[PDB]
């Protein structure tokens, strides 16, 4: 029918290979509770980037207020699961 | 009498029993879309002899 | 060095295009803050009531009843005889009515003095 | 949505939401991925080029001058996500949504089937009960005596508590109701 | 269902147009960093497409072949 | 039928679809040149323009300018 | 920049009570406790309605004058008439530029 | 359309008037010009039911492609024959009223220049 | 998540598909002469749409 | 004629007699049966009136009256029974005498032969009426209003008195029959035209008419549901049944004096139309949509031709009967939200279906949505008054172009949109409610089938 019911491993998993997708970003450094700042060393408009590439790849539009304040991977899982009433 | 004017009023009649329909036990089923569209699909089937009729 | 925008009244000055929000001064801040803390003590006194579980019913908003008594019970008591108001009752409560007699009264009088002439071609004009 | 707003956005924030406004727009000027890419990392390079600027004057003279060349530059139907305020599909499930105490005024008949659910909803009434009290204490006690400065909530700070005014929040319809 | 996601280290730029925007970049002195991000979008089935006049002919063989055999079968049964 | 999102691939594919797909394309083009071969005068005209300084002007009675 | 350290333990706590709600929105499998021909469709659909019609209007409509008026039908030289078996005479002697 | 721009750019008092057309009179160079013939007389197109359009000096043939049409209606493929003839006298009629418009163009054309050139043998 | 192999969409199309084939000639060939057709044409007149449309 | 009127005199004493818990199915059972006995006077004839006595009589034009007088009345005592719960039995009982009392005077108006009874009975409806609204009403504009009801009416219906016995020291009687057997042509003087003007603005003030309206937003407002339902629904045909009947005397003055009021109904039509636009009030809002709809009925009567005359009855009936929809419905979330705030409940079409629906039916028969009675008399107004005057289509068509603009957004506005959150004490639609609704809406309908039946006299 329509889309499959997604869960909580299929966000973790999609925000990762996006980040990983990254150039900047060390593949192997990364981890779901790697700060954007103080663990990479990304500015805010990397910051900026980050966030509309993950709004790309889910295809929903995260307001720029609740985007500042998104610096951890596990942060962006946890939004975008408030944001599609995922519980698993 | 001809059947022409039978076949085209019948043609319009026959679109109205569906709605007649809508507070029976086919409204709460699941069934409704497809008889719906097999009434729809009837009354053209029905409405194609009176157009055989005028191009003959 | 781009062709200005010019705002109207249907089409008003965008929030990035005017100049209050980039000349800042420490009373405008003030004054941000100060309307902040008012929207915040709102939103708390409803929020108060909205959440609470013993509630049933309507949460009664004073601003709804202050609009709609100042828009039906509150005009004629506000109300003065001005040179303005008078003209602008007299005008627009008093022209219209002699511009449609007017047109009307020429019209008829035209189709009466056709039709007093013989000339309107009022065949098949059985209903009326 | 979910944030509580501040008094002011600083020049920090409306350098980055004009950042990511004309990355926006560009992106539906360039349809296509490689000429959007060239451009974005143009119009990156653009952005960095005053990155350490210190004199706020001029980066407030300079953040005026590329507001006014986005409003000049702006795609006149740029692209707006389906969800989005200005999307296709912004509000099309509001008529869905129905509130949760509706279940109050339900047949007994009615309740009769998923007898399940109605239980559950009856500890999550009486756990909404129980708890009414200590949020209000909690709020009164946290708040200035002036009153509250910004919309932000405090979080339980005890064991057996929960965060004040919760219910609505949490008890939400959803995205897809139906 | 039961469907994971493929390897991150298949995506490469390699013989892509995001190659070319790469060099127009490094020709000013600034790179792209989300270039491998949209690799997918020319890696697969994606890699070549048809072009305007092609999509217009998609089934020009097989109709143009059914015509020629109709009239070559029709011609010479006409000749009775 | 049952098919699967692939993220990133080129979506699963019917064989019924395609050669659905490729027999009505090559249907409509056979039909556009059978008729182009039969009715090619619905297109090209049937009865040619004639030419009106072609028409001499005794074919129009026309007298020679002295009556 | 960045969550506050209350506002962070703030959502974990609603994120939690939000997915137990979500978690109790579920159905057990005995939810829904519910309390305790070949070709029939063209007969009562087509056949009945048609039925209807054709009486009403053979023997109360056409039973009124001028209620059903048909179009005159076409007549062509060399034709034959039904009614009277008159004959209509050919179309005059086309001048035959062949 | 090159008749368009004779008329609205060039002389327009050379060229004929498609609401004021014909006028000189239909003898004035012709020696004999024999009435136009009609096969179907006013009773068969009445019949027949043909538009007072429809009703033109090709209305025999029209009448023939009718009559096949209602005569061999499941092969609709069958009235061609008919249907080219009427065609045909349909042309044939378009070239008459071309004929005209071009005859009353150059006699427009030649009466003006010849009053001209007499005036211009008057000028002493 | 493409996936248009469903019969009823795949039907609903190919039966309009069809009649946006042949419809015209079908109904072209059956329905009586209405008017008087336009026999003679300048033939860059004729041709004035298609022109007009691939241009 | 006494056949309707006994009985309805008789539901006083079985109201008074009746238990405390009985009263209202009493009254209910008893004026449906009532109902049905008035349904035998739609048996009219085609050259003269039903002469049942020298007191009474009945014509085409007043039988679909009567017929939805006595029929308003059971819509009334359900309607009424819901805010009268905590009511003890002596004032409810009261309630119910004053209910027949308005429609005992309302029979007895509707079929008065003499000019002066009628005139009588037609001021007599003026008490229950107000005692109604300054009693049972609920706020404290109820007596302001009352007032506003009161000397409106007085005021241009006592010269009208003065002109009737004038009448008849003149012509010798007042006897409708007589008056039209024996009319004479009015002559072009300064004392005929005032004689015109008494017997006309009695009635004007009564429709209202554009400029004498103002007392119609407070009183059905500030009214309870059944005191605005008999308003717009009966008591607002009183005027046009009036003028209707005493136009015969006023030829052919009319054809000279209907000029200012033609003129205030036509545009008064349009203002009215604009300001239902912008109302926040929703029971004003259909306040104002009645006085543009009799503005319609004026300016059919005023023209003075069959058409008119049949458009006109058929409006009023429709008219009649979609307003009292309407005031229901309203009431109806008023009963729950204790606000007549146009916005402040939204969104009701996701928590009351059914009653959502009697909302979208009732704004559709209010647009006059073909074929229903509603268009058929705006359109026979209005094929009239273009015979009248073809300018007059500008401004007609106008008026429908806004008469569709604030229906709609009555029914945007209250039932469409997303429901207000703090609000959650709306509990489902009841079996009364829906019977109402059904009752209101079902003869409307069945009216399509049968319109010559409402069509009056001229048919
Ligand atoms: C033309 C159709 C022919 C039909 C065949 C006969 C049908 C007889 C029906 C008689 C009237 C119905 C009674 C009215 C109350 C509704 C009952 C109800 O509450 O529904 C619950 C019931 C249970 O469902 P549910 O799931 O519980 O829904 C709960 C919610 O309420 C959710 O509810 P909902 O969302 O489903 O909405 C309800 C639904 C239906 O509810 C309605 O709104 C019905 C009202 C429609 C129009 C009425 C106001 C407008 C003014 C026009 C006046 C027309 C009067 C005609 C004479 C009537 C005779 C009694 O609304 C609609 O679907 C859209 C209505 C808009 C129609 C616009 C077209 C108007 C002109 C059409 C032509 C009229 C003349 C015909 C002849 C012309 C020459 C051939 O639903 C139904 O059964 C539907 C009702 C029947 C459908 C009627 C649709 C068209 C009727 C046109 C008039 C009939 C003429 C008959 C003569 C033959 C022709
Ligand atoms: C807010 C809405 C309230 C309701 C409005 C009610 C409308 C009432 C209007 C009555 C219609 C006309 C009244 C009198 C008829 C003619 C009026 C006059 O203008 O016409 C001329 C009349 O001539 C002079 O003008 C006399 C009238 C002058 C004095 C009247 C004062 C007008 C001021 C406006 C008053 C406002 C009306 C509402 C008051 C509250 C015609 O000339 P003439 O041929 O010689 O007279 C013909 C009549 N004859 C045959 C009997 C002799
Ligand atoms: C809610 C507000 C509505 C107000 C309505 C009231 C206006 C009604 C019109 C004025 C009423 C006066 C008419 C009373 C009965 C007249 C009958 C009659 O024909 O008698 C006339 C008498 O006519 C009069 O005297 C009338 C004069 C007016 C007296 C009262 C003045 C009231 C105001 C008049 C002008 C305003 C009218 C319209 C105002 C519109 C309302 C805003 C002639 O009698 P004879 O003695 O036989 O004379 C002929 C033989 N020689
Ligand atoms: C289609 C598009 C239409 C046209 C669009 C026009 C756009 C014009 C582009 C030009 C923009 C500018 O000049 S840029 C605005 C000029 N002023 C400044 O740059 C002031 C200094 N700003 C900072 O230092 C910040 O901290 C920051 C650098 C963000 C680092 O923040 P982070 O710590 O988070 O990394």
Same mark, same amino acid.
């Given at each position: ?19 990983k ?9 990364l ?43 596990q942060?962006?899982?946890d ?10 | 009498?001809?059947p022409?004017?039978?076949l085209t ?6 679109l ?9 036990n ?13 009434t ?8 194609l002899?009176?157009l ?5 | ?18 100049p ?11 004054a941000?803050?100060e ?25 009664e908003?004073?601003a ?5 008594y ?5 005009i ?16 627009f409560?008093?022209?219209?009515l002699?511009?449609?007699?007017y ?5 008829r ?7 007093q ?12 | 949505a ?8 600083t020049?920090?924030?409306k ?9 926006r727009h ?9 000429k959007?890419?060239?451009?974005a ?19 407030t ?17 740029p692209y ?10 912004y509000?099309?499930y ?10 109050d005024?339900?047949?007994?008949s ?12 009856e ?6 009960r ?11 006690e ?13 979080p ?5 508590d ?17 | ?10 995506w ?6 995001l ?26 089935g $994606? %890699?070549?497409? !048809?072009?305007? #006049? /092609? +999509? ?7 109709? $143009? %072949?059914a015509? !020629?055999?109709? #009239? /070559? +079968?029709?011609?010479?049964l006409?000749?009775? | ?7 990133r ?10 050669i ?10 056979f039909?556009?040149?059978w008729?182009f071969?039969?009715?090619?005068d ?9 030419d ?9 009675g ?6 | 920049?960045?969550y ?12 939690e ?5 979500l ?7 005995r939810?829904?406790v519910?309390?305790?021909r ?20 053979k023997?109360?409509?056409t039973?009124?004058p001028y ?10 030289p060399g034709?034959?008439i039904l ?16 | 359309?090159?008749?368009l ?11 004929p ?17 024999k ?29 023939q492609?009718?009559k096949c ?7 609709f493929?069958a009235?061609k ?7 045909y ?5 378009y070239?008459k009223?071309?004929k ?5 163009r150059?006699l ?7 009053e001209?050139?007499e005036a211009?043998?008057?000028?002493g | ?10 039907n ?6 069809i009649?946006?084939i042949?419809?015209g ?6 329905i ?7 026999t003679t044409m ?6 004035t749409?298609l ?5 | ?19 405390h818990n ?7 059972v ?18 003269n009136?039903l002469?049942f006595?020298?007191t ?16 308003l009345?059971?819509?009334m ?5 819901s ?32 000019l ?15 005692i109604?609204?300054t009693?049972?009403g609920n706020?404290?504009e ?11 009416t ?6 009208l ?9 003149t ?21 005929n035209?005032?004689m ?7 009635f ?10 103002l007392?119609?937003?407070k009183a ?8 605005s ?12 049944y009036?003028?209707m ?30 300001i ?14 009645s006085?543009?709809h009799?503005?319609?009925?004026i300016?059919?009567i ?15 009936i429709?008219?009649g ?27 009701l079409?996701?928590?009351?279906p ?29 094929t009239?008054?273009?015979?009248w ?11 429908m172009?806004?008469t569709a ?25 009841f ?12 003869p409307?309908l ?7 039946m ?6």
């Amino acid at each position: 029918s329509d889309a499959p019911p997604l869960t909580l491993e299929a966000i973790k998993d999609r925000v990762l290979y996006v980040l990983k997708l990254y150039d900047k970003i060390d593949p192997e450094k990364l981890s779901v509770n790697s700060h954007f700042m103080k663990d990479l060393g990304l500015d805010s408009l990397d910051q900026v980037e980050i966030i509309m590439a993950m709004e790309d790849e889910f295809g929903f539009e995260i307001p720029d207020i609740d985007a500042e304040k998104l610096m951890c991977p596990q942060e962006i899982v946890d939004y975008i699961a408030d944001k599609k009433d995922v519980y698993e | 009498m001809n059947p022409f004017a039978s076949l085209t009023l019948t043609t319009l009649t026959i679109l109205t029993i569906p709605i007649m329909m809508s507070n029976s036990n086919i409204y709460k089923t699941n069934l409704y879309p497809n008889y719906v569209k097999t009434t729809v699909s009837y009354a053209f089937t029905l409405s194609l002899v009176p157009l055989l009729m005028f191009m003959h | 060095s781009f062709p200005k925008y010019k705002p109207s009244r249907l089409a008003t000055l965008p929030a990035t295009l005017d100049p209050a929000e980039y000349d800042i001064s420490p009373e405008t801040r003030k004054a941000q803050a100060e309307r902040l803390a008012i929207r915040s003590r709102l939103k708390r006194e409803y929020l108060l009531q909205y959440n609470d579980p013993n509630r049933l019913g309507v949460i009664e908003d004073p601003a709804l009843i202050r609009w709609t008594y100042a828009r039906s019970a509150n005009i004629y008591p506000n109300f003065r005889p001005t040179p303005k108001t008078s003209l602008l009752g007299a005008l627009f409560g008093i022209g219209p009515l002699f511009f449609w007699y007017y047109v009307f009264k020429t019209d008829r009088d035209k189709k009466e003095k056709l039709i007093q002439e013989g000339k309107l071609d009022q065949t098949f004009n059985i209903s009326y | 949505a979910f944030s509580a707003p501040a008094a002011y956005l600083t020049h920090q924030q409306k350098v980055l939401r004009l950042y990511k406004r004309a990355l926006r727009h560009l992106e539906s000027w360039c349809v296509h991925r490689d000429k959007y890419r060239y451009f974005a990392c143009l119009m990156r390079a653009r952005f960095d080029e005053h990155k350490n600027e210190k004199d706020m004057v001029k980066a407030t003279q300079l953040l005026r001058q590329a507001e006014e060349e986005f409003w000049y530059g702006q795609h006149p139907q740029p692209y707006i996500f389906p969800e989005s305020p200005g999307g296709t599909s912004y509000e099309r499930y509001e008529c869905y949504k129905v509130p949760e105490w509706c279940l109050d005024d339900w047949h007994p008949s009615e309740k009769a089937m998923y007898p399940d659910y109605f239980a559950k909803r009856e500890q999550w009434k009486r756990l909404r009960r129980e708890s009414w009290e200590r949020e209000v204490k909690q709020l009164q006690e946290e708040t200035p005596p002036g009153g509250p400065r910004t919309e932000a909530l405090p979080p339980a700070r005890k064991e057996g508590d929960l965060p004040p005014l919760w219910w609505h929040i949490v008890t939400r319809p959803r995205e897809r109701p139906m | 269902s039961k469907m994971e996601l493929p390897d991150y280290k298949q995506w490469k730029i390699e013989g892509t147009p995001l190659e070319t925007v790469q060099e127009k970049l490094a020709a000013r002195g600034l790179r792209d960093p989300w270039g491998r991000n949209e690799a997918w979008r020319y890696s697969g089935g $994606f %890699a070549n497409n !048809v072009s305007f #006049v /092609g +999509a217009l002919l998609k089934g020009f063989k097989w109709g $143009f %072949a059914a015509f !020629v055999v109709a #009239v /070559g +079968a029709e011609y010479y049964l006409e000749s009775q | 039928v049952h098919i699967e999102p692939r993220y990133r691939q080129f979506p699963q594919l019917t064989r019924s679809q395609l050669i659905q797909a490729e027999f009505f394309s090559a249907t409509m083009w056979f039909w556009i040149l059978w008729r182009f071969w039969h009715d090619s005068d619905a297109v090209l005209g049937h009865f040619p323009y004639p030419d009106p300084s072609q028409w001499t002007d005794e074919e129009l009675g026309i007298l020679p300018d002295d009556e | 920049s960045g969550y506050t350290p209350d506002e962070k333990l703030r959502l974990q706590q609603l994120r939690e009570l939000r997915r137990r709600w979500l978690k109790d929105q579920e159905l057990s499998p005995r939810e829904p406790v519910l309390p305790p021909r070949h070709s029939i469709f063209a007969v009562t659909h087509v056949l009945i309605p048609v039925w209807i019609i054709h009486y009403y209007l053979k023997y109360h409509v056409t039973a009124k004058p001028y209620t059903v008026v048909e179009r005159k039908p076409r007549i062509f030289p060399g034709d034959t008439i039904l009614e009277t078996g008159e004959v209509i005479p050919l179309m005059k002697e086309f001048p035959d530029q062949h | 359309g090159a008749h368009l721009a004779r008329r609205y750019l060039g002389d327009a008092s050379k060229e004929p008037d498609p609401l004021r057309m014909p006028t000189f009179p239909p003898d004035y160079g012709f020696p004999e010009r024999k009435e136009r013939e009609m096969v179907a007389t006013q009773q068969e197109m009445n019949d027949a039911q043909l538009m007072l359009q429809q009703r033109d000096y090709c209305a025999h043939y029209l009448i023939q492609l009718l009559k096949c049409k209602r005569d061999s209606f499941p092969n609709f493929l069958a009235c061609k024959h008919e249907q080219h003839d009427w065609d045909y006298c349909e042309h044939l009629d378009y070239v008459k009223r071309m004929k005209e418009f071009e005859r009353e163009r150059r006699l427009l054309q030649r009466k003006k220049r010849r009053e001209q050139r007499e005036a211009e043998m008057a000028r002493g | 998540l493409i996936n248009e192999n469903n019969p009823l969409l795949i039907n609903s199309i190919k039966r309009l598909l069809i009649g946006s084939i042949f419809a015209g000639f079908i109904i072209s060939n059956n329905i009586p002469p209405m008017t008087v057709p336009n026999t003679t044409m300048p033939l860059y007149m004729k041709m004035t749409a298609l022109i007009v449309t691939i241009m | 004629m006494l056949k309707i009127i006994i009985p309805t005199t008789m539901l006083l004493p079985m109201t008074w007699m009746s238990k405390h818990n009985m009263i209202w199915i009493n009254a209910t059972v008893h004026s449906l049966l009532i109902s049905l006995i008035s349904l035998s006077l739609l048996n009219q004839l085609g050259e003269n009136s039903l002469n049942f006595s020298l007191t009474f009589f009945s014509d085409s034009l007043s039988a679909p009256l009567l017929v939805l007088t006595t029929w308003l009345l059971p819509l009334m005592l359900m309607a009424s029974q819901s805010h009268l719960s905590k009511e003890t039995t002596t004032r409810k009982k009261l309630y119910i005498t004053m209910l027949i009392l308005l429609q005992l005077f309302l029979i007895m108006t509707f079929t008065a032969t003499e000019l002066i009874l009628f005139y009588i009975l037609f001021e007599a409806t003026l008490v229950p009426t107000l005692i109604i609204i300054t009693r049972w009403g609920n706020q404290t504009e109820r007596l302001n209003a009352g007032l506003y009801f009161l000397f409106y009416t007085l005021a241009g219906s006592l010269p009208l008195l003065v002109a009737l016995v004038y009448i008849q020291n003149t012509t010798g009687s007042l006897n409708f029959l007589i008056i039209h057997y024996w009319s004479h042509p009015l002559s072009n003087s300064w004392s005929n035209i005032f004689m015109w003007l008494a017997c006309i603005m009695a009635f004007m003030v009564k429709m209202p008419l554009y400029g004498l309206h103002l007392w119609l937003p407070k009183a059905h407002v500030e009214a309870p549901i059944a005191g605005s339902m008999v308003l717009a629904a009966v008591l607002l045909k009183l005027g046009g049944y009036g003028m209707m009947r005493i136009t015969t005397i006023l030829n052919p003055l009319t054809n000279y004096m209907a000029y200012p009021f033609l003129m205030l109904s036509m545009w008064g039509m349009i203002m009215t139309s604009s300001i239902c636009l912008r109302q926040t009030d929703l029971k004003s809002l259909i306040a104002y949509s009645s006085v543009s709809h009799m503005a319609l009925v004026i300016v059919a009567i005023m023209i003075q031709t069959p058409w008119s005359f049949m458009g006109a009855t058929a409006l009023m009936i429709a008219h009649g009967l979609t307003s009292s929809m309407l005031f229901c419905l309203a009431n109806t979330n008023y009963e729950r939200v204790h606000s007549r705030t146009m916005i402040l409940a939204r969104g009701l079409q996701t928590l009351l279906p059914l009653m959502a629906t009697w909302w979208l039916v009732a704004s559709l028969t209010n647009l006059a949505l073909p074929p229903s009675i509603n268009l058929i008399g705006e359109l026979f107004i209005i094929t009239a008054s273009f015979s009248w005057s073809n300018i007059t289509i500008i401004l007609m068509g106008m008026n429908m172009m806004i008469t569709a603009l604030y229906s709609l957004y009555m029914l945007i506005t209250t039932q469409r949109g997303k429901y207000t959150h703090h609000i959650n004490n709306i509990k489902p639609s009841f079996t009364r409610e829906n019977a109402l609704m059904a009752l209101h809406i079902l003869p409307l309908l069945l009216l399509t089938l049968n319109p010559k039946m409402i069509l009056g006299p001229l048919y």
